[PDB]
Amino acid sequence: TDPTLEWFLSHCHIHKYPSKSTLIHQGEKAETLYYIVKGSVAVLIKDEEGKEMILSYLNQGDFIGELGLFEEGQERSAWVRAKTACEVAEISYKKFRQLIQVNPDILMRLSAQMARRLQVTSEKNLAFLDVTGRIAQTLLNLAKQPDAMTHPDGMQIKITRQEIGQIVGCSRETVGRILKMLEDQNLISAHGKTIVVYG
């Protein structure tokens, strides 16, 4: 059992959100503070060219819209929507601040993840971003070449890591540093001399 969680939730209101239903709409005045008891949700924005862009998926046990607890008035840059029928608890920010006085443990939890949530995004300057822009261009251009292969996901090209570095003007390593990053962004794919560009 979980002494705190159970206490915490006895101060929250749990409701169900059928898939695709929206939990928080975008310029809403933040005052909660949502805790996912079960199921998953998505954080969406619209980029230039008004396409839905997924910022993150949040799963059971995670919290929703902190960033509004430490920023009065703060709105909701990007709005929360359910992906699967899920139960979510929500508590007045005002009342939550009271819980923290009583037993500052829950605060520890939420405080948590984030951290485990940051320890995953980071370990990542101007000089660096420049090369990242150049390499992305090289791959973008090669996909439009007549010698490009057609891939179910997009276009597949042929080039060595050293060739990328020679073209852009960087070490073979810097290429791997960037290729790995781009690959983690689900934008490209690297295996030997074969590289595939998505979209």
Add this chain to the structure above:
Amino acid sequence: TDPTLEWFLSHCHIHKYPSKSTLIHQGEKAETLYYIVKGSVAVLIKDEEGKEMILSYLNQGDFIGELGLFEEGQERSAWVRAKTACEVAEISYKKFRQLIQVNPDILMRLSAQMARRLQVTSEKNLAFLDVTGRIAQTLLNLAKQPDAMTHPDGMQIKITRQEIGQIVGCSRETVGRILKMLEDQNLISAHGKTIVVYG
């Protein structure tokens, strides 16, 4: 004045650091937890070969390795040095964990900082990363121009939002969004026609 920051301060050792003196080394043993009372530091890393490729820039009102606090173990890759001569207060994780109980307010400001770092992360395709590389390049070359200003943090140049768009080949809005990002990353600062390039 800042009460919750005044108590939390009396409960820990504040250290002075001359510029270019390292605070945190690689492989460390995470048990702190520093708070920059005054000045600025730089999160470095030594790369493939060598080259201190930098990583960040933390200033007054910042916590350090706050990720270590949670989750036993963790020393501790990363790195830290003082850019300018700065005063840094530090406290053992375990004592802090006790203070959290005494007055949780300080756990607020630690969580607050973590929240802000999430904001920056979520706000991140190939085409976009390409433009980001070109824009940084324009700012990079201009700071080396004879008509650049001497700024305490680096070099300050003169250019409008639309001028950058014309050079790179993007909308006036695209420049706006990218300038926001780069300023949040602590690489530049924008104020009207004035743009200052750090470093």
